[PDB]
Amino acid sequence: EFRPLTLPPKLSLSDFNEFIQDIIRIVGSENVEVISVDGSYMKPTHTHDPHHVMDQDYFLASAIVAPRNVADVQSIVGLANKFSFPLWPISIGRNSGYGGAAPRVSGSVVLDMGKNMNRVLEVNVEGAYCVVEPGVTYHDLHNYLEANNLRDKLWLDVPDLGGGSVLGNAVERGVGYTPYGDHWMMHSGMEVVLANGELLRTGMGALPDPKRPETMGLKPEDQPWSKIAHLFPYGFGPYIDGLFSQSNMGIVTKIGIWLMPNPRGYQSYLITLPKDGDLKQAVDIIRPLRLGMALQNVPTIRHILLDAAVLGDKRSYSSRTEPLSDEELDKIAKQLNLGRWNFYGALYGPEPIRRVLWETIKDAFSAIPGVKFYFPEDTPENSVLRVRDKTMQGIPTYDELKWIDWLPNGAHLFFSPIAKVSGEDAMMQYAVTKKRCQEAGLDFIGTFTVGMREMHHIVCIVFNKKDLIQKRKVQWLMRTLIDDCAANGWGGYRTHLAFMDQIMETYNWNNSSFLRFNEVLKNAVDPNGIIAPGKSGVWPSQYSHVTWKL
Amino acid sequence: EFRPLTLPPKLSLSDFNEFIQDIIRIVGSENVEVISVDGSYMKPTHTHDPHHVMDQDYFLASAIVAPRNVADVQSIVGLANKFSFPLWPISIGRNSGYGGAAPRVSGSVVLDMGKNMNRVLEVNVEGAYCVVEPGVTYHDLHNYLEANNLRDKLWLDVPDLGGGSVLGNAVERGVGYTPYGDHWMMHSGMEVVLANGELLRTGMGALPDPKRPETMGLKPEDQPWSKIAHLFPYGFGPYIDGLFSQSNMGIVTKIGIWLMPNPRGYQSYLITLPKDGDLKQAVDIIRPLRLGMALQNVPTIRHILLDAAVLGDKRSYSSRTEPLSDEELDKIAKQLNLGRWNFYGALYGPEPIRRVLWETIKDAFSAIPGVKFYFPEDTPENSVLRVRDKTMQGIPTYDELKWIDWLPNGAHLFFSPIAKVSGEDAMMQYAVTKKRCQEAGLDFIGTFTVGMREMHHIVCIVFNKKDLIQKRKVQWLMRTLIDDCAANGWGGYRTHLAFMDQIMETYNWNNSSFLRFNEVLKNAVDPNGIIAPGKSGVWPSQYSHVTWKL
Numbered sequence A, B: 001e002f003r004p005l006t007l008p009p010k011l012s013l014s015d016f017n018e019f020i021q022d023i024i025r026i027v028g029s030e031n032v033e034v035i036s037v038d039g040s041y042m043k044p045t046h047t048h049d050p051h052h053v054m055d056q057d058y059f060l061a062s063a064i065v066a067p068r069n070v071a072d073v074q075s076i077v078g079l080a081n082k083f084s085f086p087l088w089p090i091s092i093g094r095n096s097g098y099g100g101a102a103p104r105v106s107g108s109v110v111l112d113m114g115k116n117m118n119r120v121l122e123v124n125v126e127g128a129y130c131v132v133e134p135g136v137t138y139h140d141l142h143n144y145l146e147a148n149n150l151r152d153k154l155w156l157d158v159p160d161l162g163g164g165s166v167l168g169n170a171v172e173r174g175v176g177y178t179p180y181g182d183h184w185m186m187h188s189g190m191e192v193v194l195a196n197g198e199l200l201r202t203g204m205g206a207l208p209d210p211k212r213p214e215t216m217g218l219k220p221e222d223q224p225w226s227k228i229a230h231l232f233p234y235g236f237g238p239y240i241d242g243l244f245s246q247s248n249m250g251i252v253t254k255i256g257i258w259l260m261p262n263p264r265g266y267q268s269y270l271i272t273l274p275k276d277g278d279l280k281q282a283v284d285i286i287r288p289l290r291l292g293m294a295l296q297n298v299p300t301i302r303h304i305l306l307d308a309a310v311l312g313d314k315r316s317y318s319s320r321t322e323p324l325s326d327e328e329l330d331k332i333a334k335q336l337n338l339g340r341w342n343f344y345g346a347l348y349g350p351e352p353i354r355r356v357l358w359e360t361i362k363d364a365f366s367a368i369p370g371v372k373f374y375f376p377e378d379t380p381e382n383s384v385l386r387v388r389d390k391t392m393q394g395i396p397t398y399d400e401l402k403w404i405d406w407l408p409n410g411a412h413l414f415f416s417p418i419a420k421v422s423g424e425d426a427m428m429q430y431a432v433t434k435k436r437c438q439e440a441g442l443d444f445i446g447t448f449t450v451g452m453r454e455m456h457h458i459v460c461i462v463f464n465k466k467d468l469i470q471k472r473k474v475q476w477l478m479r480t481l482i483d484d485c486a487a488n489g490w491g492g493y494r495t496h497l498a499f500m501d502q503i504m505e506t507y508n509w510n511n512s513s514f515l516r517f518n519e520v521l522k523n524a525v526d527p528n529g530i531i532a533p534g535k536s537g538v539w540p541s542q543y544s545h546v547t548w549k550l
Ligand SMILES: *Cc1cc2c(cc1C)nc1c(=O)[nH]c(=O)nc-1n2C[C@H](O)[C@H](O)[C@H](O)COP(=O)(O)OP(=O)(O)OC[C@H]1O[C@@H](n2cnc3c(N)ncnc32)[C@H](O)[C@@H]1O
Pocket: A088, A089, A090, A091, A092, A093, A094, A095, A096, A097, A098, A100, A101, A113, A134, A158, A159, A160, A161, A163, A164, A165, A166, A167, A168, A169, A171, A172, A174, A175, A176, A250, A251, A252, A253, A400, A401, A404, A412, A532, A535
């Protein structure tokens, strides 16, 4: 297909057309769409960033290809080398507010690993793990579980929504909410297609499965994995798996994820914190409850305007234009029966044990006047708790998609710095974010996700994507928070395409010794800069910093 | 000094003699020793392999060098890059049975990082971590904790002795036995002198500490870390930390290890399994208890002789010269009130929790005939339990050093296959290890140690170093052991100087993709291969494989 909307760098129109011809040849014209439209969460766009803060046709693909299998991805890559055509690998492209399936480099070949590469490849009950291809969602897998009666032997671990790729997410080092909440950490045995074309699997994945008659002459892609590939991550020698998450080192095609066995008892809960400044003493309570394994999962500390947005848009609470006042938020609390901060957690295992954690935790949160403890049953039926009951046992919902609609034309954008598990420090980060949010005229909407020693601060910027003034006011908001938080010793853990460069430029100890060392290894494995140039600030030698950096 | 027994390759006497003169002018004479003796554990040697299977002077330094600071380390890397001089950094060189201090490539400059770089830079009671330089033995840290009263707040995680470098062990991916027994996975934020000699700090350690007066003008080494540096492993971008374990990618100057807080209750236990065959059912029982979290640490399953040999050498049991027979093992067992296998574990936390777990466990092991339960107090003054009851609470000890003296000239080498947590697999490996020890006319000594989903199975080969026929026999054993276990889908997780190239060739999936990838990265980062060429089987392009491997 002839004249495209944006071409990749240095490439003539003639060369685009010969390139696509061989791709159309290899994949069949079903699995190639040249771009010469915004959609929804349910039929996700693979051309552009749906929750856009820049121009809509800023981060935009030139084509989209859907490899049917692993050798298609070798062919396509071997090809992209031949021309020097940037690629952008996506699994499901539901990386929304992080840019979705937009390419950082306008003119790229967004690579739809997900549309066809689809298989739940294995579920191992005694190993308590599973192998996933990029197309398997959280829901896909969940529906694999229930169709096989495995729901009663192994539980999953899920983000706020079920659309996401199991692997795409894990590679992004993302976060769920059971004891198995640290997604990346739960990986074992990765299969990666390298920039050069050569296939790789890491860990004991490199320890070959012993030869047998039934497996002879099977393509590397389709071979089985040795018995320990997915039980020990490290294998032998340097442990490279992590070079491949939040990186442009490769294209991931298979990934082992560990699964938590049915604990033998479950109960979720909600403790409500009446005042705004109850954050500080809360976190101070969570601190040695987390560190001492009285809090087994990854709990959340939701802000009121987060649940408020799930149960109904802004307009149905106030007709005001500025962000809502402190007294107005108080009303919304007593309205919905929530506090200013809500702490959502869950207990796991046999009744004898849940009993004691609960008595400890209740008993710990008693030094806060006005507190209140809820099990799911005790709430409204629309309730967030009633949904999150499901999220903390590995049952994927979509309910939470709604908070995106806090403002006319729904679009989000994340700022996720990292703070200490101290009440003091948590307050500080909230006061620094809150301040810059009013200056920008937004509301503050957020959650802290409690890791053992660290805390993920998710600043949920919603804006209406057809207000040309506010989208710039967000652009200014975003650039200031990164800076402000750096000035204060916090950095983001993940970002949107437009802010990769800054955020990485944030981590500049000893004159960017981290980036310079990364740039080194990139140029070594990808001599031609074709795998996802730009990702996480990391530019190859043939993308000039000046022309490219944002 | 003028004349060492061995020169590093392609290096002249006159060059060597400049390098040395040059080296001496930096670090003073007291800190530099040419070599023109096996030492102890109490004062480890730094030139060669103390428990040496190969020739006594097969792995040999040409000199030792102790930098008084990171700037020295830097200065040295500088010279070595000029002269193309192999380095071989050790922290403490206690790596016996993996080669102690000995350098993969003879003629290397052993960098004794520990002698002067020593300090415990930090114990952070909120963070439940600590920050350690290459010289901080376990024991050293232990005594530090004591002299600052922290013993009733933060506990350590020790491996079977106390000499070990807190960090040297960590970047070997070593293993101890509290619930924080996965040492490598407890690191957050490491510092590193790269091969080029540029200084790098990883993870959050890349986000610098914000400017204030009191730190202005400090050399990069002596700059503090930013707040989240040792609480969140990951930073932002591609996670490179792993690159620096069991690899030769950098020289490590500092590291942050998580410390586990006093858990508010502690009980250890011995479970004796009376039959050789009980291992099989025994592991099956472990599988669900491990994975459902009833077992909180790295319990281990020790072969009986282990305890035998801690208690008194081979002679003290029979003047027999060949391996002791099955029946003598039944004899010895009963003699010491032990089983044919031995399970050691611990209970952490309040009395109510301990209670419940310990019943779940008693009960589950009861299905094995003639099983018997002992607490510390229930056993004789000299017991292994009484020793491990210490080990399991982060207290360093050394009694276990005895087993090394099974034979006239004690020396141990290790073989370290990973294994499934399934009895049938476990027995398979036992069979195969055992048959082979039998054929080399050796006494089988092993443990498995219980990972979450895997088991580290440490075949403990011990032979007498002055016996050339035995030495040679042990070199046939290991090489056979690596091969057989590969042929049945089991890799070794860590090895000895003289088996590194072999073990790697074992992880050869898809025409060795793993090593080829790793050889690529290593040349990028170390053009003149001065850092530890050879480690883990990974070689620079100037070390021809034909010349160098084994
Ligand atoms: C708007 C939204 C997002 C969200 C969320 C709630 C809302 C309402 N809650 C989340 C949660 O609690 N936990 C979490 O981790 N993320 C949450 N999000 C963010 C996001 O939408 C989801 O996490 C989603 O699962 C991620 O998108 P997806 O799973 O569909 O993956 P992707 O679009 O392909 O993005 C991956 C990025 O990484 C690189 N990448 C991805 N896959 C590969 C493979 N196959 N090979 C090589 N590189 C890959 C890409 O460069 C891409 O940028």
